[PDB]
Design a protein around this ligand. Structure first.
Ligand SMILES: *[C@@H]1O[C@H](CO[C@@H]2O[C@@H](C)[C@@H](O)[C@@H](O)[C@@H]2O)[C@@H](O[C@@H]2O[C@H](CO)[C@@H](O)[C@H](O)[C@H]2NC(C)=O)[C@H](O)[C@H]1NC(C)=O
Ligand SMILES: NCCCC[C@H](N[C@@H](CCc1ccccc1)C(=O)O)C(=O)N[C@@H](Cc1c[nH]c2ccccc12)C(=O)O
Ligand SMILES: [Cl-]
Ligand SMILES: [Cl-]
Ligand SMILES: [Zn+2]
Length: 575
């Protein structure tokens, strides 16, 4: 029993390394060069890797997994028994792979055009209109146009995608795809734990929402903003109103205290995508963490190709399963926003490098939330006025302090209900409580319930707004982002403590702290080898997810918001 198990794990690992490396390549090739040929080669590799998965997965299921002594081995075999899509019969298997490829392709190439005019792509054109335009109708054209073109086009594929991914999940022992995804956390109390954390951030969100709603009322007109209703989704400076920092200019707490045009600063000082990633690399090494290999700089795609190729622009980090080849694919724009994203992605790479000596089956984050959290933690320190000033992007009071906290809130707080919402919708789609006849209506029901937003244009049949969001056609679970935002503040707090910081948490900058880098390294090295509370414990000195660190970070702002909203008589929420 035990000898056969150990040998099977050694065999699974070495063969997986070769097969996964070959697949990642074909996948990378298509993502950075969308053509018919790279599509064909990828769909073929899908079949390959599935053969390997079926071979070892069928083998793994022959082991009674609670009859093994060694924990690590027993952990691996349990994972290999999950074939994921490879559990689907051949016919359905190919259909599903093609649907995924088609969805991903439709999304990444969609454009919005003006008749007899210029066509706009999502990055960087439509995101720029959403971030900079302050004209209601122009924002609506981009918001509606993007959903008209990308969202509607995904609808034809989604019902079949749902049926197939659910079938694969049940063939692996789950009730539906949502049950399968949630299992990545190995936390029975997950749904209730997350609902509690969401409820804790309500005072802070509702107050931010009310304050921003008043500022939008001032700028766009009493005729377009109901001070007691939901905010129109196209006015937050982001295509999905998931982060609101691009409308900072409309909501500055203390306009007397101007802030430097960071983007103009970055452009003026000649910052390039390569420089942005080099600065991220420097922050990681300052902590005593690992530098990205020379190979990374040679093979990554850090900016949109201008050679004629079409590519998947959405930022992503890649592990090629050989402990040497790690790359990032991003159509990088030179601005603060993308600087944070670059750190986010370098966090993924650091995790890859840290657990590279682990059996490939355990080469994952403690839980998907951890993987998403690493780069953001460093980006929190990078974002401080003190640190930006050191990069010569800012020129530098309590007013500048509340201004900074507002800038951070517009991103971090606003994102909490959106990140919660996405998979609330998907889990219900997966379990069958939301049918294809109610996809869109239930999406907006949740957009209203959690974010307090409404569509600027009433939705119609044929619309499928979820499809207009990357993670939906790409089938990338979203709840990891909600977890990430809660825990990254817990990591920030613990790391700051470790670093010897005293005073308000929001003033902490962990740059060059070897004590911080040590906790992150020890936790990251565990990969998926232990249940995540152990990694949580290693970083924070405790095992639970908690909203207290985020609440403490933003306490001064909550106090300011309550005073500001109450003097203006705001009715919190959207009755
Ligand atoms: C349980 O087994 C793990 C893994 O052992 C390795 O993988 C086996 C399948 C087989 O190939 C063994 O020869 C390998 O050693 C053990 O964890 C390893 O422990 C060593 C020494 O402590 C350490 O160098 C490795 O990094 C560990 N690897 C992992 C994946 O954690 C573990 O010691 C065994 N536990 C018991 C109860 O003996
Ligand atoms: N310019 C846009 C940058 C996109 C970066 C990122 N990309 C995903 C890719 C997953 C993938 C997995 C597998 C295959 C393909 C892709 C990720 O890294 O996980 C992403 O989605 N982030 C989320 C929210 C977010 C959490 N932190 C951030 C810090 C900064 C900005 C946003 C965020 C979102 O934007 O909704
Ligand atoms: Cl939407
Ligand atoms: Cl997840
Ligand atoms: Zn990520």
């Amino acid at each position: 029993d035990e000898a056969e198990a150990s040998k099977f794990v050694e065999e699974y690992d070495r063969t997986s390394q070769v097969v996964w490396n070959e697949y990642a390549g074909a996948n990378w090739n298509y993502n950075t060069n969308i053509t018919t040929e790279t599509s064909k080669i990828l769909l073929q590799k899908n079949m390959q890797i599935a053969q390997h998965t079926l071979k070892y997965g069928t083998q793994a299921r022959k082991f009674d997994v609670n009859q093994l002594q060694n924990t690590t081995i027993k952990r691996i075999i349990k994972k290999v028994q999950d074939l994921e899509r490879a559990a689907l019969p051949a016919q359905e298997l190919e259909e599903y792979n093609k649907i995924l490829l088609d969805m991903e392709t439709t999304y990444s190439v969609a454009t919005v055009c003006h008749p007899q005019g210029s066509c706009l792509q999502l990055e960087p054109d439509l995101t720029n209109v959403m971030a900079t335009s302050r004209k209601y109708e122009d924002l609506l054209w981009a918001w509606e146009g993007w959903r008209d073109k990308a969202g509607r086009a995904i609808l034809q594929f989604y019902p079949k995608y749902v049926e197939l991914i659910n079938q694969a999940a049940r063939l692996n022992g789950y009730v539906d795809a949502g049950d399968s995804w949630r299992s990545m956390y190995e936390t029975p109390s997950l749904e209730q734990d997350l609902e509690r954390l969401f409820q804790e951030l309500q005072p802070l969100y509702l107050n931010l929402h009310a304050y921003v709603r008043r500022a939008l009322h001032r700028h766009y007109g009493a005729q377009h903003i109901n001070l007691e209703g939901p905010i129109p989704a196209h006015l937050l400076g982001n295509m999905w109103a998931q982060t609101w920092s691009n409308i900072y200019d409309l909501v500055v707490p203390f306009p007397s205290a101007p802030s430097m045009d960071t983007t103009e600063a970055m452009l003026k000082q000649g910052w390039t995508p390569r420089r942005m990633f080099k600065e991220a690399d420097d922050f990681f090494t300052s902590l005593g963490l690992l530098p990205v290999p020379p190979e990374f700089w040679q093979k990554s795609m850090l900016e949109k190709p201008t050679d004629g190729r079409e590519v998947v622009c959405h930022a992503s980090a890649w592990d090629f399963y050989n402990g040497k080849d790690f790359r990032i694919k991003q159509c990088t724009t030179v601005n603060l926003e993308d600087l944070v994203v670059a750190h986010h992605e370098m966090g993924h790479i650091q995790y890859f490098m840290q657990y590279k000596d682990l059996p490939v089956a355990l080469r994952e984050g403690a839980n998907p939330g951890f993987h998403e959290a690493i780069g953001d933690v460093l980006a929190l320190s990078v974002s401080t006025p003190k640190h930006l000033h050191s990069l010569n992007l800012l020129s530098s009071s309590d007013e500048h302090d509340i201004n900074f906290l507002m800038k951070m809130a517009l991103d971090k707080i606003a994102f909490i209900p959106f990140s919660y919402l996405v998979d609330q919708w998907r889990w219900r789609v997966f379990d069958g409580s939301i049918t294809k006849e109610n996809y869109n209506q239930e999406w907006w029901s949740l957009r209203l319930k959690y974010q307090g937003l409404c569509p600027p244009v009433p939705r119609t049949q044929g619309d499928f707004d979820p499809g207009a969001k990357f993670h939906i056609p790409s089938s990338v679970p979203y709840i990891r982002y909600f977890v990430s935002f809660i825990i990254q503040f817990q990591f920030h707090e613990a790391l700051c403590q470790a670093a010897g910081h005293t005073g308000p948490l929001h003033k902490c900058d962990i740059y060059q702290s070897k004590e911080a880098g040590q906790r992150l390294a020890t936790a990251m090295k565990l990969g998926f080898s232990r249940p995540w509370p152990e990694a949580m414990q290693l970083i924070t000195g405790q095992p639970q997810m908690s909203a207290s660190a985020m609440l403490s970070y933003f306490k001064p702002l909550l106090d300011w918001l309550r005073t500001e909203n109450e003097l203006h008589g705001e009715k919190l929420g959207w009755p």
